[PDB]
Amino acid sequence: QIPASEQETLVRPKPLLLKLLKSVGAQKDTYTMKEVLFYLGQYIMTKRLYDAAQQHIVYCSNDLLGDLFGVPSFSVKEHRKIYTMIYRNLV
């Protein structure tokens, strides 16, 4: 859904997103978008923001992730919409 060139572009998270990434072991100030998604995925799995019965929805209410994305839940199927929510959180 997302072109490879766009996934491989270097970006600079704002500090709140950076906090999130660091919490699951990220160590740098800049990442490709593909790396940002890897660490966000790790964060969702670590904090169990998944739902066993309807796995395609992430539940992020009362979590830093929901404050950054501006939503209490989102569909994992919507890659462009997820990219947009992440771009809001970059310098």
Ligand SMILES: COc1ccc(C2=N[C@@H](c3ccc(Cl)cc3)[C@@H](c3ccc(Cl)cc3)N2C(=O)N2CCNC(=O)C2)c(OC(C)C)c1
């Ligand atoms: C039918 O149910 C599905 C279908 C697809 C996905 C999914 N899809 C993957 C994905 C989704 C969006 C993008 Cl832009 C890239 C990769 C990845 C993922 C990565 C980052 C985020 Cl923010 C959310 C999910 N993701 C996953 O499958 N993940 C999350 C990361 N680590 C995992 O072990 C599994 C899914 O994830 C939930 C279990 C959270 C459930």
